[PDB]
Amino acid sequence: LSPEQLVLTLLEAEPPHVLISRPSAPFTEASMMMSLTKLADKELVHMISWAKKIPGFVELSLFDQVRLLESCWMEVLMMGLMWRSIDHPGKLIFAPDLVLDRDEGKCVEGILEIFDMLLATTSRFRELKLQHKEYLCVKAMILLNSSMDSSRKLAHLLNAVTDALVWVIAKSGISSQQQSMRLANLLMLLSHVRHASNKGMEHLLNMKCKNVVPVYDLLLEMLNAHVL
């Protein structure tokens, strides 16, 4: 499969646009947090379908498929969140009916910090003018590179996606030196996504432990398995 057609399959694996079915209204600590948790649960279901649509993912041992998704899920959600928020400076587009501002994250302790991180990193991708196909490859790489024979298949798959990202950049037509530079800058921003992810999970875990947010089945499972 050529890099172009691999990217096509990632495009085809994209989850549908998700909404929380919430009527417009001022967000309070309780509403905001329950909406965030409810959204994350819904997106998790779609995330699993996405992963299985990536060529060869279902060929991995069930154990591998499980460990990869358990470790990267919050990072994948936040990478999606940044793509959606790319064209909306100053805002975090969790969903069409879940658009949050910096000052709104203040009514929830520890959240503002995280939002500022998400906003700043989004701003970086904005500066670099992240392209849709680039987002597609990076998102898939976040999943496949979370591996903290089945193992060779994975390596083959990750290399396939990596080769795809290099192709996307090559198509932009920029100079070879600028291609290497762009490739490096995109990959280095992933550390920032991962960082915001770790903080995001720690925040969710605390909320869960305090039973302040209704923790749906799937979300709870993913959360516990990941922290464990």
Binding site: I48, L62, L218
Partner: peptide, 10 residues
């Protein structure tokens, strides 16, 4: 087992 059922169903 939730993640597993979704990984093994369509």
């Amino acid at each position: 087992h939730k993640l597993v059922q979704l990984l093994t169903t369509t």
